[PDB]
Symmetry: C2
């Protein structure tokens, strides 16, 4: 599993304001990391918006998944245990914008 892939996966159960539901998530970590840990770091996709703050729009880039990437909510998940399913990849431009947002808070 590569950085930049969108996977459909259940994030439940959750507490409080935590992002809920089965939804697309974007893989942040690279293949080697994902292979060794079996615990990729992902950010969730939620619902035609413009990029603003931690929310990066997926509109107009040629992919099937719609909405925005919530770069403020990274989570380490056991994709295999949760039964995630690979959907597609995002263009490197989107991935780099996401990495840029995460860089402001995880470094």
């Amino acid at each position: 599993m590569e950085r930049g892939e969108i996977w459909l996966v259940s994030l439940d159960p959750t507490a409080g304001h935590e992002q809920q539901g089965t939804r697309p998530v974007l893989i942040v970590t690279p293949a080697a990391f994902n292979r060794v840990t079996r615990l990729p770091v992902v950010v969730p996709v939620t619902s035609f918006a413009r990029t603003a703050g931690f929310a990066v729009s997926l509109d107009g880039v040629g992919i099937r998944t719609t909405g925005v990437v919530r770069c403020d909510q990274p989570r380490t998940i056991d994709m295999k245990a949760r039964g995630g399913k690979r959907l597609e990849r995002v263009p490197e431009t989107i991935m780099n914008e996401v990495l840029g947002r995460l860089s402001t808070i995880l470094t």
Copy 2:
């Protein structure tokens, strides 16, 4: 809720190899972010620094073990009933950010 604080909190329920239990976690995101979102990003503490694991030892921290810088998670600290324990020295926080940052390389 500041970057560098260790809080004791229930992480459950989680799946598979994800960390579980009620354990110490280290807050990675800054106070303003934590206030606005109510959803700090934390890395868990589990029982020498090696790879993504940063040792808490030798620097006056009461919490023992290693910080798993490879396992960030966004949690609602308040909803889970987290309790603030202590704050790590900046040297430790800088080592943690150093390792954590590499997930973005």
